[PDB]
Amino acid sequence: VGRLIYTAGGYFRQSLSYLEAYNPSDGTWLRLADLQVPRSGLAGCVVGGLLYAVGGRNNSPDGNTDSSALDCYNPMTNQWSPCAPMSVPRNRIGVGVIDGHIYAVGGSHGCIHHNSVERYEPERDEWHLVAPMLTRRIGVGVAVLNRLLYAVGGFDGTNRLNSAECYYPERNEWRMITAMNTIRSGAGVCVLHNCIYAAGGYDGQDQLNSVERYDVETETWTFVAPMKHRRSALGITVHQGRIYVLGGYDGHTFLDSVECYDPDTDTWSEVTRMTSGRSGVGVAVT
Numbered sequence: 385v386g387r388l389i390y391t392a393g394g395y396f397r398q399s400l401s402y403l404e405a406y407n408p409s410d411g412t413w414l415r416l417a418d419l420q421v422p423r424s425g426l427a428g429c430v431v432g433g434l435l436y437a438v439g440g441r442n443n444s445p446d447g448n449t450d451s452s453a454l455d456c457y458n459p460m461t462n463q464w465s466p467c468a469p470m471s472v473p474r475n476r477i478g479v480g481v482i483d484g485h486i487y488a489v490g491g492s493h494g495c496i497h498h499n500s501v502e503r504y505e506p507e508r509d510e511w512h513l514v515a516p517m518l519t520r521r522i523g524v525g526v527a528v529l530n531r532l533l534y535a536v537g538g539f540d541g542t543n544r545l546n547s548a549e550c551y552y553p554e555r556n557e558w559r560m561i562t563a564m565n566t567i568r569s570g571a572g573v574c575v576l577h578n579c580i581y582a583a584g585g586y587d588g589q590d591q592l593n594s595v596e597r598y599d600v601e602t603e604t605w606t607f608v609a610p611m612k613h614r615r616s617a618l619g620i621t622v623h624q625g626r627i628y629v630l631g632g633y634d635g636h637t638f639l640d641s642v643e644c645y646d647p648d649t650d651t652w653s654e655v656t657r658m659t660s661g662r663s664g665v666g667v668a669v670t
């Protein structure tokens with residue numbers, strides 16, 4: 385009865401409003417308060433025991449479906465709360481937390497492919513922009529390791545990317561790192577045991593099940609055990625020293641499948657399934 389896995393938003397026929405907490409130990413799902421606005425291709429994160437949903441794409445009927453919204457969920461009260469919106473709409477967004485601050489990375493607004501990045505301070509409820517990335521990335525994967533922010537893969541508006549870059553907060557500058565072996569957009573990126581994992585995604589022709597991690601020491605991307613299902617636009621997070629992937633699109637079907645990665649045995653495996661297949665969710669743990 386400790387920490388739970390929270391899934392918010394997603395897509396099936398349209399942008400979804402579901403918020404659902406999964407309990408890995410007893411294997412159950414709990415339906416929570418809906419998002420005030422349905423959104424797909426959003427990102428989730430956690431700061432001070434609070435759940436945030438960032439950007440994405442809503443179901444607005446006026447032609448403006450790209451979201452610039454930031455929303456806060458309080459588990460203790462089951463209340464969603466609107467926060468200060470970002471400086472620009474960011475669909476297919478990537479998020480990372482450093483020292484209690486949320487970084488919104490890349491994403492898209494219509495034909496605009498953001499290389500820009502902004503930082504949200506919960507203690508001030510403010511968004512301030514920082515140094516833009518070296519590359520424009522939508523469908524980018526973001527993760528944080530030792531107070532450094534990594535932007536991985538994506539789509540620069542012309543080509544799908546295998547390249548990755550690193551953000552140094554104390555210098556406000558970006559620095560390219562070693563590229564992935566695989567071209568990936570809409571991948572699952574996270575930090576587990578001092579490595580940066582990149583799972584699934586879309587190489588431009590197929591959805592992927594291959595998985596590779598990055599080591600700062602050797603500066604190399606090496607493959608690990610592949611997922612049971614190819615999937616892009618998947619939700620990802622860590623729980624109890626294991627990696628969890630949620631939903632996604634395999635090319636024909638919006639997956640309800642949920643797989644778990646054991647780094648000690650280098651094994652993947654389905655452990656449960658969501659209440660309904662869906663892609664482009666945001667996920668966090670608290």
Ligand SMILES: COc1ccc(S(=O)(=O)N(CC(N)=O)c2ccc(N(CC(N)=O)S(=O)(=O)c3ccc(OC)cc3)c3ccccc23)cc1
Binds near residue numbers: 396
């Ligand atoms: C037509 O089927 C789909 C597929 C995915 C969705 S989604 O609701 O999920 N969604 C919507 C969004 N808010 O943008 C997303 C769509 C596409 C994404 N990719 C683009 C990118 N730059 O990463 S993707 O690389 O992953 C991809 C590529 C080709 C595909 O067709 C075979 C399918 C997906 C999204 C990437 C991340 C989050 C949402 C995406 C909905 C319907």
